[PDB]
Ligand binder design. Structure first.
Ligand SMILES: CNC(=O)CN(Cc1ccccc1OC(F)F)C(=O)c1c[nH]c(C(=O)N2CCCC2)n1
Length: 293
């Protein structure tokens, strides 16, 4: 990992794009390249700054946002920027919402699993993301490429494995838990545990007591098994990210069309115990029976 020392005085700051898990983030120019700059808000995030910087220096992967360097005066991170938006916004955010397909859904989760598998394989110690959730996953290239962001950690109750907020010892399997919640979220286009709401502790209570998102009607059993094993209480029962990536990869053959940009408009009604999926599985069943006949 080789980061550039960058001189802030050759950075042309533009509009604020949003504020991450920590910090504020702004679009900008630098050497005539569009970039995103992340500045410490109040120096209460100077822990979370030196954290994100130290680990992001090591990492180089297509599905993780590439750090270009940092500045000393003032102290700020400099990341690649591209047109797009958070997975969160795409799923749930400002109308009109874009239409997406099962393929988009499965591709988003495969690409997340790829980026996290990379992190878990880091030597000599695994990087645990530990704040995986749709607000920290960026969609780019017409909503087709997903990039992981926001490593400040090293709002999240809904995605968070029970053992992490139990105060316990936890491992890279905390991520696998989050991954599964997310898989459920892209399939359903619903916010996990939104019906519960309250404040955070009501969700924590619920999950700690074994509550999980509801099962999905008509969901292919192979997807149902992956998802619910990701959600197991016992972290040793959850699959490795490498297993996931292999399973998702093999699954994609029944989900052509990941590479279509999000271009079509959608207005979707939002209806319990077994929810309907937002994406459609009919084509998957068709393709599956074709291969298995
Ligand atoms: C409509 N979009 C939004 O509501 C907010 N974002 C995403 C965004 C902002 C701040 C922090 C993380 C973000 O995305 C994702 F990481 F969750 C953006 O607009 C955006 C667009 N491109 C980018 C980008 O390239 N980034 C590089 C890492 C920080 C954001 N962010």
């Amino acid at each position: 990992g080789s980061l550039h020392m960058i001189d802030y005085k050759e950075i042309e700051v533009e509009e604020v794009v949003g504020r991450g898990a920590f910090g504020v983030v702004c679009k900008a120019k630098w050497r005539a390249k569009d970039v995103a700059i992340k500045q410490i808000e109040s120096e209460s995030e100077r822990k979370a700054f030196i954290v994100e910087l130290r680990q992001l220096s090591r990492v180089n992967h297509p599905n993780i946002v590439k750090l270009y360097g940092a500045c000393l005066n003032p102290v700020c991170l400099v990341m690649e920027y591209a047109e797009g938006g958070s997975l969160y916004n795409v799923l749930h955010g400002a109308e009109p919402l874009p239409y997406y397909t099962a393929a988009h859904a499965m591709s988003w989760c495969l690409q997340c699993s790829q980026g996290v598998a990379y992190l878990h394989s880091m030597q000599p110690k695994a990087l645990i993301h530990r704040d995986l959730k749709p607000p920290n996953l960026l969609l780019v290239a017409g909503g087709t490429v997903l990039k992981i962001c926001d490593f400040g950690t090293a709002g999240s109750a809904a995605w968070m494995a029970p053992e992490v907020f139990e105060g316990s010892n936890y491992s890279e399997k905390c991520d696998v838990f989050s991954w599964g919640i997310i898989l459920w979220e892209v399939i359903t286009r619903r916010k996990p545990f939104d019906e519960i709401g309250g404040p955070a502790f009501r969700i924590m209570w619920a999950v700690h007591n074994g509550t999980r998102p509801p099962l999905i009607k008509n969901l292919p059993k192979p997807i149902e098994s992956l998802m619910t094993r990701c959600w197991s209480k016992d972290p040793s029962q959850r699959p490795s990210m490498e297993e996931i990536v292999k399973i998702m990869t093999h699954l994609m053959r029944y989900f052509p069309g990941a590479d279509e940009p999000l271009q079509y408009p959608c207005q979707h009604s939002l209806p319990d115990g077994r929810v309907e999926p937002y994406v459609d599985f009919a084509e998957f069943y068709r393709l599956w029976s074709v291969d298995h006949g």
